[PDB]
Amino acid sequence: QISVRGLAGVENVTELKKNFNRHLHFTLVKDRNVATPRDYYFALAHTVRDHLVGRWIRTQQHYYEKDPKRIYYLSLEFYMGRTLQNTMVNLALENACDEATYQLGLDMEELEEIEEDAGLGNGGLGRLAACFLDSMATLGLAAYGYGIRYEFGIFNQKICGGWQMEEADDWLRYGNPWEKARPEFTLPVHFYGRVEHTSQGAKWVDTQVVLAMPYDTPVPGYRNNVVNTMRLWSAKAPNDFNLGYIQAVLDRNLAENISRVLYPNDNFFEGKELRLKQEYFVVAATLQDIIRRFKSSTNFDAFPDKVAIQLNDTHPSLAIPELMRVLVDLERLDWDKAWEVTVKTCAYTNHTVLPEALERWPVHLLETLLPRHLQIIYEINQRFLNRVAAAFPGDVDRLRRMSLVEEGAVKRINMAHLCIAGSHAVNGVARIHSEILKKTIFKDFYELEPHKFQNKTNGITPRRWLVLCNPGLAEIIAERIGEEYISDLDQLRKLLSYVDDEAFIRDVAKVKQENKLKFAAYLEREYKVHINPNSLFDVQVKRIHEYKRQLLNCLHVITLYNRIKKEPNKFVVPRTVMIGGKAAPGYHMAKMIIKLITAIGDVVNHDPVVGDRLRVIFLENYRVSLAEKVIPAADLSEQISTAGTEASGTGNMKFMLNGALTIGTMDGANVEMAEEAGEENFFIFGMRVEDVDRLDQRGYNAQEYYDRIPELRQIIEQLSSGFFSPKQPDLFKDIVNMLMHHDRFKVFADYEEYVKCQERVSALYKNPREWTRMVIRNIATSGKFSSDRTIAQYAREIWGVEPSRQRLPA
């Protein structure tokens, strides 16, 4: 059908069709009289998978022969989403499979919808890992993603009576055609036990053993024949585990619970033992695998030359003391040499400055679970603090501040401090974030070792986030500038020369309209909700969090509603306000915010005076597959976190690439986005980081805003009195109380500027031509935010490896 989707040659189409029928028969054990759409999906998935394996085997053979430096990306989350279309895109099979299935009398897009998301992540951090894997493969790096194969990923969100309900994401029930179990490479992982000191050093003994079984998933590069591996560990009990008899077998679940479920927290630390076990489990199994591969090339001086370990947040921070443990206790290296190797091998990416998100493990947990690691952390700390003391003599406050061990009622290990000490590089994820790190929470460390601190602004893969989810836009762009931009997104700058091109303006606007119609149809079909596709699609999709300020969006929505109710017969630009995202199950305020959104919808969507001029939709079960649908459909991207709180954001970048304008604070990567596009082409509002600091200094008083803004008063009075909850007038008391008395994120302080800025948005939307021209200016300058750029920077500035667009033999 379209060019970017590749060739549909007669030879390939015929070959795909026969292998499809082969898999349906031999693999699925079905005939075409009993086969369901799901069977057809699996037959296609198996057919496409076959095309990966040849390239997968030869890529891994290529690495064995060339022995390049290997990159190990350690993450507790990989938010992969669906794999079928991505695989087709990267192998140039999309049109051929489209043709092959059509000739079999099947709609491929229908089959694509059957695939479950691999939802092994919470949001941005897990999705960043997924984009990174894609870019590393596309840039020909010898890279391995290492994580946990959760049996249950991020919960499926059901909305019931306006409330979030969670259900288990049983993503593996029908099987996962993409993974290959590798039980032959199963590794033991040790827990508990005790430390014994001998003549020949420390020994970790009397441990409980849990087996780590790897499952390998192929990660194809974009049309370069590179297929890298994501290896995910599954917890298995040893066969002599607890070996009355029946109970001992049933108690195997205790061990295997380690890989059972993803902790559903976004940007929030829950100090639970099971989570710590997960963190060590991935680290211990991964490091053995790394060392095994390294030895299969005794001399650990070359370890840092052949290995890079990237810590995605502090979650895999135990890699540092674990590497030390292995080098010192098992390989018998002296401390100093082991430490040198460790530091040069490890690098740490920080993703947050929110205090509640920072990992601080109680010493008593580490003492019981990982007694040798605690000893190593203590020794790391002492030697590190000796360096601090030597650099800043007499500065006893600094010593306390920089210690890996935090004092208090419960002693804790600050994992971020551990990571900085044991890494040669520490990076933030957007320029403003990296600067905040050096100025605030890691200031002491930056003063001690300024060379360690870097920025690596986040990115998104233009394969998934343009070509896959927005083929129409990919195509109209390719018509003008060719296909090279897909793996060289900076080429989108060439589109600046088309900003006054009447054909291009029409096409850009046509593609958006088509996307909106398709999404309006999706909503009716799958959720039975009526929306006006001519309205401005105003969308905020991301995890529900106070810092992300879905509440500020809510206030604006109510403002628009109240203004309509006051002047019913005045013209307002029609809007469909879509808000979606999951709340962590234990996050009460976030669950209340979801209820508020639906409560507002229940009032607004049924007011006859409003008509179709304002609709409020809560998008249920927001996830990667839903993002791929709603983002291409968006006109306005809400990126309205309090300045200084959203480390980068990546949703922002997705919207920019897909032809939405951005309303946002100068937070995270929004700053760089506005810088790239030009501030004129962004809807920037609200406090900057410095304004937030000034407000904190004099004290934030929400009442002041309430007293001085009548429109804001009205909303709060509406919330308090039960306007949006008549049967439970006090339902939103917690929300109002928080807003009025303990709002850490200063919702009210940005309200006026936000509403005003939103008026500027509506004004521009009234002029379709100028809206689209600004859209073109955004798409055209979104090149910097390709994860190919990000990964190339990691490669050159941290990992010490050169990216390559050179193709491997097919």
Ligand SMILES: OCc1cn([C@@H]2O[C@H](CO)[C@@H](O)[C@H](O)[C@H]2O)nn1
């Ligand atoms: O554990 C802290 C954390 C941070 N994050 C998110 O990481 C993303 C990827 O770097 C960022 O874009 C986002 O700003 C951050 O909140 N998720 N969890």
